[PDB]
Design a protein around this ligand. Structure first.
Ligand SMILES: [Mg+2]
Ligand SMILES: [Mg+2]
Ligand SMILES: [Mg+2]
Ligand SMILES: [Mg+2]
Ligand SMILES: [Mg+2]
Ligand SMILES: [Mg+2]
Ligand SMILES: [Mg+2]
Ligand SMILES: [Mg+2]
Ligand SMILES: [Mg+2]
Ligand SMILES: [Mg+2]
Ligand SMILES: [Mg+2]
Ligand SMILES: [Mg+2]
Ligand SMILES: [Mg+2]
Ligand SMILES: [Mg+2]
Lengths: 49, 185, 104
RNA sequence: UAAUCUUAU
RNA sequence: AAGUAAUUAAUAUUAGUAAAACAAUAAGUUAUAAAUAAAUAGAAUAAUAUAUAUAUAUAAAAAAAUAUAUAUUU
RNA sequence: AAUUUAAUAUAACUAUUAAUAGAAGGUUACUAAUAAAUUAAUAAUUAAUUUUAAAACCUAAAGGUAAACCUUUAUAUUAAUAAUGUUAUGAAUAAUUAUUAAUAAUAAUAAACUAAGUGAACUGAAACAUCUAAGUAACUUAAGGAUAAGAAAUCAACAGAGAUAUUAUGAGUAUUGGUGAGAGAAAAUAAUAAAGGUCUAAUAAGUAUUAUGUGAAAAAAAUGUAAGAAAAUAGGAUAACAAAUUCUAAGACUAAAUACUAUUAAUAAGUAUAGUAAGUACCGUAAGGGAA
């Protein structure tokens, strides 16, 4: 038989559930494009110098 | 500190048994009462399986003289028999403890508290006995918190009728069997 | 641009995926529950009031920063001000010489 | 003497 | 039925390359400078030691020791 | 058409490399059998995949026992019916047979490799006592196909690196030793290697640290006894202190290169006394030894 969860463990679980419920940070296409453009600019600058 | 002599221990990984699968050759008679303790049961200082030793195993080392003539000695922990009060169980529980463990118990403010601390270190330095004690306490706490309603009679009412129905078809029916049938329902 | 982004080293890419640059993460230590909580800083958990260790441990953070420096993607990473680490030319310039060097 | 410990039922 | 093998070090002979060799991915080992416990020292100011370098000593020499120099570096 | 040479077998072991995978003995008998399907190929077929029958007794752990035997009673109850004969007053009480439903059972399981516990001595030091041999042999326990380790309270040195594992150089260098016998790193650079990072923790206290007793020949992290902190404004790291630097313990997961066994393939300046029998004959009360 599985051992029951103590109070602290339950509270931690609840916190984790709350965290999950919130909207997750996800890397957008736009952000990637912005990064990629900056990388390209950096490469161009390196080539120049 | 570390818990090397505890967390080194490995136990045979039991395969998860499906309801429709074939039996193992040796199935036990009486069922498992307690949960499985992650770190098994100590296979060295078996003295400590019976008590709350706080992960304090026997050392072996060297007696060394003025001549530096080395001779093997052992260093036992300061074990002590001690009947300490459980608030949850409403009884005092007598066990072997290290003096260190007794000190920790005193610091934490009770024996139940010591048992139920959620840290992994505590779990490691609970014994198998300590794990069983913890389970007993935790289960009791859960019961106190949450009584069943916050069904048996209905079952008792239906049982004789069910038996009669069975008899009318042709077969006899026992209680225990009835209980087994209508556990999940 | 997308292809260039993809061509970035693995660790850096992973970091960008799981802590993206749209969120302006805090310079200072914050609540662990916060959305803008910096993964490089030790954030305090609001209930227990204990400082959690940084989500990116210090070595990993340093590696990520070096990768960003290499590919010119520093400002998209969250700030490393209040983590005590400086890096390369900035470190060289900003540091005070040891008491032993200046005053033997 | 509800520190400890020994015995008997 | 009895001087064998492995990992190493020092000599010798030959063969390859040679002020370089082995290795070529870099790194390393040996050589290319002698000393000194060690240190920030190290080889003709106008030539053979009568000069120079180092260690002791010293203002700098001398003094003991070893090493370095007389078209081409060994 | 035959002969020869080289290679290949159900039919050798050994070493290496590569690839793949993690596996029944005995006893004597009322002898311990099998049946099928689908798909492909060439109705029968061979091959692949799947299903299915039987299978005694012994091999610690149903209960015994002097292994291959004995005793338990699943060709059992318990109940419900049906058929039969007897007892006492259509109904009742016991027995036998035949259906139906309900109730439990079968450890022969590797060895090597790994981790943990305990831990010698001969021996070396031309004696021997610290030291060595050596955390070796051994015994004991526990796990998995591998285990262990692993994403820095790590190294380094003001420049920097970025988990671990194995090997080469570093280097027999630093380091250490009755400064004897002898023991001996790390950084760094290369390979091998896999996608190698990633949260699962409400960020960790009788914990760090201290005293003391022990503790891998150098280099600690451990540990019995007892005192015992701090919040990132902090904490760990070096005799010590001041500066600086670096990392975040007391919560976790993890392929891969590796070890061992077996199989298959290939290569043998290997074996015919390292070439298949036999762990037999025989020796011993026994553990055990062991032929031709
Ligand atoms: Mg002088
Ligand atoms: Mg048996
Ligand atoms: Mg008898
Ligand atoms: Mg061992
Ligand atoms: Mg001797
Ligand atoms: Mg003698
Ligand atoms: Mg030793
Ligand atoms: Mg593992
Ligand atoms: Mg932590
Ligand atoms: Mg912490
Ligand atoms: Mg200590
Ligand atoms: Mg050794
Ligand atoms: Mg941590
Ligand atoms: Mg692990």
């Amino acid at each position: 038989p599985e051992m029951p969860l103590t109070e602290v463990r339950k509270s931690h679980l609840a916190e984790k559930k709350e965290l999950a419920e919130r909207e997750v940070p996800k890397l957008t296409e736009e952000d990637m494009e912005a990064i990629g453009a900056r990388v390209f600019e950096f490469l161009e600058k390196q080539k120049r110098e | 500190r570390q818990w090397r002599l505890i967390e080194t221990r490995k136990i045979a990984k039991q395969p998860n048994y499906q309801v429709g699968d074939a039996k193992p050759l040796h199935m036990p008679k009486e069922r498992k009462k307690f949960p499985d303790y992650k770190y098994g049961e100590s296979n060295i200082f078996k003295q400590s399986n019976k008590g709350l030793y706080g992960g304090s195993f026997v050392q072996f080392g060297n007696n060394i003289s003025e001549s530096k003539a080395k001779t093997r000695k052992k260093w036992l922990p300061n074990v002590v028999k001690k009947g300490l009060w459980s608030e949850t169980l409403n009884r005092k529980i007598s066990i072997k403890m290290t003096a260190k463990v007794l000190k920790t118990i005193s610091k934490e403010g009770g024996i139940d508290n010591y048992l139920t601390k959620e840290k992994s270190a505590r779990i490691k330095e609970l014994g198998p006995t300590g794990w069983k004690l913890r389970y007993r306490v935790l289960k009791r706490k859960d019961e106190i918190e949450n009584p069943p309603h916050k069904r048996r009679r209905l079952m008792s009412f239906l049982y004789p009728l069910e038996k009669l129905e069975y008899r009318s078809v042709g077969k006899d029916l026992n209680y225990k069997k009835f209980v087994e049938l209508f556990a999940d329902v | 641009y997308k292809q260039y982004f993809d061509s970035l080293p693995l660790k850096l890419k992973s970091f960008f995926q799981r802590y993206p640059p749209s969120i302006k993460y805090s310079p200072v230590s914050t609540s662990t529950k916060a959305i803008n909580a910096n993964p490089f800083l030790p954030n305090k958990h609001p209930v227990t009031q204990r400082f959690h260790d940084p989500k990116y441990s210090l070595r990993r953070m340093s590696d990520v920063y070096k990768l960003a420096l290499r590919y010119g993607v520093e400002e998209f990473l969250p700030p490393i001000e209040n983590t005590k680490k400086l890096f390369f030319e900035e470190k060289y310039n900003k540091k005070t010489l040891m008491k032993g060097v200046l005053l033997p």
